[model samples]
Target: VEDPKDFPVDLHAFLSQAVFSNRTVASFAVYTTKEKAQILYKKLMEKYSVTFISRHGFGGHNILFFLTPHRHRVSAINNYCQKLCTFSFLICKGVNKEYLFYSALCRQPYAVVEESIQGGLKEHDFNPE
Candidate 1:
């Protein structure tokens, strides 16, 4: 199978058998929807004949994993996924889809510290770390 980055449309992609390899799976992706928006996704999938790998329950949202050869047509589904279910709507690639199905998150590590050094203190033998 081809990569999803190369081809994001699920309808045109090849269908998976049973044991699709990592290369094949890398092309696979995720499509999320809220309870109210699930009807749209369901109908699109049915109309396009697109396949999925699995479906996970995330509160009022549906974390649908295309556990098949290809994935869902996200272009039409993004609107549904982006709806504020609770507070935030997220649509992302499964970085750990091959293993644990964990989403990739990035954050800063360092915290700033302020130093109020006086002139007199610096004049003294103030060797600080």
Candidate 2:
């Protein structure tokens, strides 16, 4: 099933909900073990025909990896990745996709990753294998 909510789309709106404002969330990230990450990637490939994987980095400075199916053009995806890096983190500060993309910039060491592909995005979704 597809996720009812999405990163940056649904998750960003909660910044003022009291939780996002706290630093407890700042050290936050989506966490997924490598085994699970690869499992989802294999499944996505089988079901979605996605060949390219992407890695997004943000204020977290950590690397977020994801698989993008049907991505035939390199320039388009590359450009998109570059754009992500330059965008401001104020809005993306508490976002999963934003942090996943730029996990390297994380104030705290260690990355939180997405264990399941519930949303259209994941911690490793940006990583192009």
Candidate 3:
């Protein structure tokens, strides 16, 4: 059920525009083998007839972005995905500053290190010195 034509829009660029336009967007990460990701994708499409961006992430995992114009469906979509797995998921409602920060964090390795430092220091007393 994989079709390249279905994901024509660039994931990052589309998410950026969606955030700017104040559109409702939801995404989730699937940290599993390629086979499992494919099965999950199929299950998702069976319920929602929405545009999706399935991008390959670290290793063989996947991140799925779902966008639809209907505001009501956005919540339903989020709830539905939440039941599917315990992976990371997010819902954005109009001009989300957090979305912008997250997008940058995905693309920039340095930003991730900086962000990690805070948690590391708190848990392990990590010091750069």
Candidate 4:
């Protein structure tokens, strides 16, 4: 599929495949330095049992993907993460998986994308979310 002018082509394809695989996705933007955000990310996965699909960008306005088939659980995790990080953390979560993915990517343009360490976990995998 051709890339849309409004969104990142690579991210669009990534989301497309993820949606087809029945994964529920949520995204958020943390308006802070990458180093600080990395700490937050670690706390999210290790402390709160949150898992991500990927991350886009490096500094302020970095977008992070949260992946899980349990839509309600992901939304719940989003709520906690927002509360945990008070520094302008913007979250996007909804029933439409494709929309969530595109919305996250659209927030930051020309970003350096990287996959998550535990992104390979399957939909049925027990993630404690």
Candidate 5:
């Protein structure tokens, strides 16, 4: 809904609608850090939890987040992505089954949002985690 070049991404739109909203993803400021992500990932995985991680900041000027469904996976992903946009409106599309993503913001162009596995994967058409 922001850039046209990155438009027509059906998966993205579907995710934005199905997994993003006022109830799911939280639009807040997350600390961007690779080391932090690694550390968080370790802790979450230790508890048999998996998550989707993404970083989207042009110059790595954004924060990262480790998201878990407060109740359900669908609602959690939605709210998580919704709030993530507040920070330079970066995108954190899941790169793998874990639902973890690495995001970078176009505005900052220097922020890196490192994500970690904090919970289970959403039940969708395809979920490797």
Candidate 6:
């Protein structure tokens, strides 16, 4: 049981207890060329909440990712068919899918991290290949 004082203390609390908790949606980061991004941006403006997080780091070109919490997932699917046939505009389901999408999206390295403690000595290597 939760006390009245801490009504909104936990953010996850809202997801589980809110009136529209049953309502679900997804988010995706679409990495594509600048030309395609602009075109998609204009097309999605009709009936979606598109946010643009352009790529600004190393090894990545002009990239954009927007969060569209689609109330009607089927509509999003249809949109995908209609406007997502470009070079790189992927649609991944959030909440229950694409757990490692961010790792790829953020250009994070995939590698193993080994840690050891021998004779009161500590050693760690986080080299990614």
Q: How should the candidates be ordered by TM-score, best one leading?
A: 4, 3, 6, 1, 5, 2
Per-residue lDDT tens digits for candidate 4, residues 1-129, read 321122234444333322223344443333334554555556655554544544566334455555443343444554655665554435433323444453445454536455565343343543222
Clashes of each: 4, 38, 0, 0, 47, 0
Per residue, candidate 6 scores C-alpha lDDT tens digits across 1-129 of 321221112212212222223345544333344455455555554456543222212222233333454554533533563465544433322222222322333444321111111221112221232
Q: Model 5: per-residue lDDT, tens digit, 7-122? A: 12322422333324334332222333344334433453343243443333332233333444332344443344444334333334322222322222212334433434343224
Q: Which has the greatest lDDT?
A: 4
Residue-level lDDT of model 1, residues 1-129, one tens digit each, is 321222123212232323223342332333344543344345435644543333444433444433233543333333444443454444544323232231210101211111112211121232222
TM-score winner between candidates 1 and 3: 3
Looking at model 6, the pairs that clash are none
Candidate 4 Cα lDDT to native: 0.44
TM-score (all chains, Cα) for each model: 0.32, 0.25, 0.36, 0.44, 0.27, 0.35
Global lDDT scores for all candidate models: 0.33, 0.33, 0.37, 0.44, 0.34, 0.34
Candidate 1: stretches off by over 4 Å: 1-33, 67-88, 94-96, 102-129
**All candidates in order of lDDT, best leading:** 4, 3, 5, 6, 1, 2
Candidate 5 residue runs with Cα over 4 Å from true position:
1-29, 45-48, 55-62, 71-129
lDDT of 3: 0.37
Candidate 5 lDDT for residue 102: 26
Flag clash pairs in model 3.
Answer: none
- The TM-score obtained by model 5 is 0.27
Q: For model 2, what is the alpha-carbon lDDT of residue 84?
A: 35
* Candidate 1 accuracy as lDDT: 0.33
In the range 1-129, model 2's lDDT, one tens digit per residue, is 322122333234322233224333221222222433334334434543443333223233323333333332333322333343332221122233443344342324433343234333435544453
